[PDB]
């Protein structure tokens, strides 16, 4: 069978997290470090993310607001800089790697003065303030959490949404199963697994979209908008 949960592939959860922390600690605080050598795809990524988000910003009963966003596993703030700060009055960042948050303050420049909180914490230990965010953006990090921590984190995120708020997950998806990468200490899950986890967190799908124009050799990437 393919594997369907992280408990089938993670030998030692403390080591799964410690190894990941050690891996990111020796990556340079640059876009290419964030994107694993694929820094050149950033603009394609941000353009598609922007179009996806703008679906939820149109006027109407369910319009997502534009006061505050949370960037989860934000790194140096690639997404905060080019996608979120232009659209949200304030942005909070959370990441496990202190060096990245320190570099963010340089990387983000003057606009970075609208970053309110820089939280240096693992997602598995982070509880966002209730009723605080219009958008919670979670990109290229969910693979770093166990199934139980991911489900729990998505529940706490749900409790921190403002009225009409949404959660966006954008990540690599496996063709089938749950695949361990033992170098960066992360998993890649298939769409059925990810959807199962979203549902277990009491969330529903508003939209799902495949990222186009990526290099042929990398994992497929999908975006989900949730509430």
């Amino acid at each position: 069978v393919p594997r369907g949960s992280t408990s089938e592939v993670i030998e030692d959860e403390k080591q799964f997290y410690s190894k990941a922390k050690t891996y990111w600690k020796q990556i340079p605080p640059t876009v290419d470090g964030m994107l694993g050598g694929y820094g050149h795809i950033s603009s394609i990524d941000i353009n598609s993310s922007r179009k996806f988000l703008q679906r939820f910003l149109r006027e109407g009963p369910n319009k997502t607001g534009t006061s505050c966003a949370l960037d989860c596993g934000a790194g140096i703030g690639r997404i905060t800089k080019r996608l979120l700060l232009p659209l949200f009055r304030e942005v909070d960042m959370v990441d496990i790697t202190e060096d990245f948050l320190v570099q963010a303050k340089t990387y983000l420049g003057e606009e970075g003065k609208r970053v309110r909180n820089y939280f240096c914490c693992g997602l598995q230990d982070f509880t966002p303030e209730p009723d605080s965010y219009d958008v919670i953006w979670i990109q290229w990090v969910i693979g770093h959490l166990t199934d139980q921590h991911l489900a729990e984190f998505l529940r706490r995120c749900k409790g921190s949404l403002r009225p009409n708020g949404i959660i966006v997950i954008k990540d690599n998806m496996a063709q089938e199963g749950v695949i361990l990468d033992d170098v960066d200490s992360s998993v890649c899950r298939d769409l059925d697994v990810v959807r199962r986890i979203i549902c277990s967190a009491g969330l529903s799908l508003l939209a799902e979209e495949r990222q186009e124009n990526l290099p042929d050799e990398i994992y497929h990437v999908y975006s989900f908008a949730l509430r």
Partner: peptide
Amino acid sequence: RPKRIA
């Protein structure tokens, strides 16, 4: 992070 299919 984005990455080559293992």
